[PDB]
Protein backbone atom coordinates (compact mmCIF):
# COMPACT_ATOMS: atom_id res chain seq x y z
CA UNK A 1 0.00 0.00 0.00
CA UNK A 2 1.13 3.51 -0.80
CA UNK A 3 2.13 4.57 -4.29
CA UNK A 4 4.99 6.96 -5.03
CA UNK A 5 3.53 9.92 -6.87
CA UNK A 6 5.74 12.33 -8.78
CA UNK A 7 4.18 15.80 -8.83
CA UNK A 8 6.71 18.23 -10.42
CA UNK A 9 4.08 20.52 -11.89
CA UNK A 10 3.30 22.11 -8.54
CA UNK A 11 4.05 25.65 -7.53
CA UNK A 12 6.81 26.18 -4.91
CA UNK A 13 4.15 27.71 -2.65
CA UNK A 14 1.82 24.77 -3.33
CA UNK A 15 4.45 22.33 -2.05
CA UNK A 16 4.88 24.59 0.97
CA UNK A 17 1.12 24.38 1.57
CA UNK A 18 0.76 20.69 0.77
CA UNK A 19 3.69 19.55 2.91
CA UNK A 20 2.59 21.79 5.76
CA UNK A 21 -0.80 20.12 5.51
CA UNK A 22 0.80 16.66 5.72
CA UNK A 23 2.65 17.25 8.97
CA UNK A 24 -0.20 19.34 10.34
CA UNK A 25 -2.93 16.98 9.12
CA UNK A 26 -1.16 13.57 8.84
CA UNK A 27 -4.49 11.77 9.18
CA UNK A 28 -5.68 13.64 6.09
CA UNK A 29 -2.39 13.01 4.23
CA UNK A 30 -4.19 10.61 1.85
CA UNK A 31 -6.47 13.47 0.85
CA UNK A 32 -3.74 16.11 0.81
CA UNK A 33 -1.65 14.24 -1.75
CA UNK A 34 -4.85 13.25 -3.54
CA UNK A 35 -5.18 16.94 -4.26
CA UNK A 36 -1.52 17.20 -5.18
CA UNK A 37 -2.06 14.48 -7.79
CA UNK A 38 -4.79 16.60 -9.36
CA UNK A 39 -2.72 19.71 -8.70
CA UNK A 40 0.29 18.62 -10.78
CA UNK A 41 -2.27 17.21 -13.24
CA UNK A 42 -3.90 20.61 -13.68
CA UNK A 43 -0.59 22.35 -14.31
CA UNK A 44 0.91 19.59 -16.44
CA UNK B 1 20.54 14.25 -12.28
CA UNK B 2 18.09 11.47 -11.55
CA UNK B 3 19.00 10.53 -8.00
CA UNK B 4 16.30 10.19 -5.40
CA UNK B 5 16.61 12.62 -2.53
CA UNK B 6 14.02 12.00 0.18
CA UNK B 7 13.67 14.60 2.93
CA UNK B 8 10.51 13.70 4.94
CA UNK B 9 12.40 14.47 8.14
CA UNK B 10 12.38 18.11 7.14
CA UNK B 11 9.78 20.25 8.81
CA UNK B 12 7.40 22.07 6.39
CA UNK B 13 8.72 25.54 7.28
CA UNK B 14 12.32 24.49 6.72
CA UNK B 15 11.82 22.56 3.48
CA UNK B 16 9.61 25.45 2.37
CA UNK B 17 12.73 27.60 2.26
CA UNK B 18 14.58 24.85 0.42
CA UNK B 19 11.88 24.62 -2.26
CA UNK B 20 11.83 28.41 -2.64
CA UNK B 21 15.63 28.25 -2.92
CA UNK B 22 15.39 25.81 -5.84
CA UNK B 23 12.99 28.22 -7.51
CA UNK B 24 15.30 31.14 -6.82
CA UNK B 25 18.49 29.35 -7.84
CA UNK B 26 17.77 26.17 -9.86
CA UNK B 27 21.46 26.08 -10.74
CA UNK B 28 22.39 25.21 -7.17
CA UNK B 29 19.35 22.89 -7.09
CA UNK B 30 21.24 19.60 -6.60
CA UNK B 31 23.52 21.24 -4.05
CA UNK B 32 20.53 22.74 -2.24
CA UNK B 33 19.12 19.23 -2.40
CA UNK B 34 22.38 17.97 -0.90
CA UNK B 35 22.21 20.86 1.56
CA UNK B 36 18.75 20.18 2.96
CA UNK B 37 19.75 16.51 3.01
CA UNK B 38 22.08 17.38 5.88
CA UNK B 39 19.07 18.11 8.11
CA UNK B 40 17.17 15.12 6.72
CA UNK B 41 20.19 12.96 7.64
CA UNK B 42 20.53 14.59 11.04
CA UNK B 43 16.89 14.03 11.97
CA UNK B 44 17.11 10.58 10.40
Amino acid sequence: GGEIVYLPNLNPDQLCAFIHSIHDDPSQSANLLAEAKKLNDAQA
Amino acid sequence: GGEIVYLPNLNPDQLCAFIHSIHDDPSQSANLLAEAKKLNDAQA
Binding site: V5, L7, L10, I19, L33 | P8, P26, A30, L33
Partner: peptide
Protein backbone atom coordinates in the same frame (compact mmCIF):
# COMPACT_ATOMS: atom_id res chain seq x y z
CA UNK C 1 19.17 23.97 -15.73
CA UNK C 2 18.44 21.22 -13.27
CA UNK C 3 15.31 20.79 -11.19
CA UNK C 4 13.96 18.47 -8.56
CA UNK C 5 10.93 16.39 -9.28
CA UNK C 6 8.82 16.02 -6.17
CA UNK C 7 7.70 12.50 -5.44
CA UNK C 8 6.01 11.07 -2.42
CA UNK C 9 5.41 7.61 -1.05
CA UNK C 10 1.73 8.10 -0.20
CA UNK C 11 1.76 6.60 3.30
CA UNK C 12 4.17 8.78 5.33
CA UNK C 13 7.19 10.06 3.44
CA UNK C 14 7.50 12.80 0.84
CA UNK C 15 10.79 13.19 -0.99
CA UNK C 16 12.61 14.62 -3.96
CA UNK C 17 14.42 13.46 -7.04
CA UNK C 18 16.45 15.39 -9.55
CA UNK C 19 15.45 15.66 -13.14
CA UNK C 20 17.27 17.02 -16.17
CA UNK C 21 17.78 14.16 -18.59
Amino acid sequence: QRLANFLVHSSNNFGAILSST
